[PDB]
């Protein structure tokens, strides 16, 4: 059971300088998307291409994954993503990232059917 | 269980929003401190003073509560804190935030031994 403190301090605490920060992007949508559950995922890609944008590059073109599976593809532009890689100072369960906004292509399998992104593999 | 083509559009995209805007803290921060789960919760004030300065207003001016209870205390100092508002065009899942920030007394109700903050009543 969750006490009242600490539901006063999670729905209401956020102490900080500048918590509104482009640079606590990643550590807040990591933590949004539920990839720091257990353990900080060390690599994350967020893309911000439309999703249309995104699953058109399972049309695109075809290239190698990293572990050797030939089902991914790479977009044929780059888009703008936001790279987010552990500092090196975070420790579970206080996760903690540096923000990248980059502009790259992307990389990512493809499966299903239609045939649609279901792993980000890489960005080049 | 969760599809591969919806894992990887919560892991991997992030095309409807400001990204690493300021204008983007309070929906990342709602989803992120879980008050975007069910229902959106309609309206919310994080605190950016220290966790330290926070309890310690339990112990400066009573004041009575929104809700009739004895236990609420006002803040002898502003303090710097952000409101997020659910906007107009927000429907559940998909939970949209308006932020804004501002530098007001705090209320909020103090509870247990010691006694801390339990419930963020209002800024004036």
Redesign the interface.
Known sequence: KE???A???????????S????SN?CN??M?????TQGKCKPV????????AD?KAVCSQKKVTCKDGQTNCYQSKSTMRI?DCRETGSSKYPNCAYK?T?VEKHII?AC??KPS?????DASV
Do not use: I, W
């Not at 539901?7 to 300088?17: A, C, G, P, W, Y």
């Not at 918590?19 to 482009?22: D, G, I, L, M, V």
């Not at 933590?31 to 990839?35: A, E, F, G, V, Y």
């Open positions: 006490s009242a403190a539901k006063f301090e999670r729905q209401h605490m956020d102490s900080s300088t918590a509104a920060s482009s992007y807040l949508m933590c949004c998307r539920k990839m994350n890609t967020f893309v911000h291409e439309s999703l995104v936001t923000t906004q990512v499966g299903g649609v992104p279901v792993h980000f």
